[model samples]
Target: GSMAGEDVGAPPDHLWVHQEGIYRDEYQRTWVAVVEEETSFLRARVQQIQVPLGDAARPSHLLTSQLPLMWQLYPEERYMDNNSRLWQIQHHLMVRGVQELLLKLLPDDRSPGIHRD
Candidate 1:
């Protein structure tokens, strides 16, 4: 997942290119990048910071959405909060819907691997 508004120069530190996956309890901030090949499938990778998230010993994870295909920055403290929970659930559903759409757009031959040709 490329950083939102990356083409407009959204700072290299905030821009992630070609990365994905779960980054939990790392104590540090991270970035994710997703790339789509010619086949339309996607590949993702994650980059992590070497430091910790303050002195509170709290860990954070990156939640990505394919619906609108945006990246979300979340803190560990918000996991149990009702507001946070609802937001996550809604976003997940949206992402799922978008993924299905992407699949539909690609051809049947473009399975197992993304269309890089």
Candidate 2:
């Protein structure tokens, strides 16, 4: 008798690239990427988090968006507003590629360790 293969979260082979959830970039910019199996869609967006002013231990909170206009890193020439054929991702690992792309495309001074929440 045989059994079906199990699906795993954050598979070992390609975790370095990307995984679903929240992560911070080199400049400490928090971002969220989501993958929907039902729609086979992947979307990544920047999140504005409020940091407490102090040298003490504390947590951050979410605030309203205040990102500069230039932060939209998506290349318009590549993915359009559906006036033409839009790009689509297939599955879990497929989503990671876009995440890696976002990480690479971000404007920054120094690269930081990848942290996923």
Candidate 3:
């Protein structure tokens, strides 16, 4: 789903798009997610987030409101835990989110590179 922001249009820039995914874990079990990216916001295209948090991963409880929709797209949750250490599956999604953002927004990053888009 798209974040609450102007539909500035695309080649899609300036959007912090959020997409839920179903991933396979090291255990080869199913998992759910609400992955998001900064997507180069602001006129300067500055990074809106950093690190593991940049490409945010939502926990089940946190995503309860969104779960109904997520279930149809990514229903299997082996076990979602954000109470302690981040799950390996989560980290993978987070990292992937960053890579995806960069690939989507970096080239068009208003000023390019400086914002870590």
Q: Each model's RMSD to truth, in Å? A: 16.5, 17.3, 18.2
Local lDDT at 47 for model 2? 29
Sort order, TM-score high to low: 2, 1, 3
Off by over 4 Å in 3: 1-20, 39-117
Q: How does residue 32 of candidate 1 score in lDDT?
A: 31
Identify the runs in model 2 with alpha carbons over 4 angstroms from their true place.
1-20, 44-46, 50-74, 77-117
Candidate 1 per-residue lDDT over residues 8-93, each given as its tens digit: 21211222122243232222333332222324443333333333322221122234332122333334311121122201211111
Evaluate all candidate structures by whole-model CA lDDT and list the values in order: 0.25, 0.27, 0.26
Estimate the TM-score of every prediction: 0.20, 0.23, 0.18
Considering every candidate listed, which one attains the maximal lDDT?
A: 2
lDDT (Cα, tens digit) per residue for candidate 2, span 38-103: 233334332223332232111111221111212222243222221222322122332433333221
Alpha carbon lDDT at 91, candidate 2: 26
Cα lDDT tens digits for candidate 3, 4-112: 6443121111122232333222322233333344344211111222323233354423553222221111123222222221111121122332322111112222443
The top-ranked prediction according to TM-score is 2
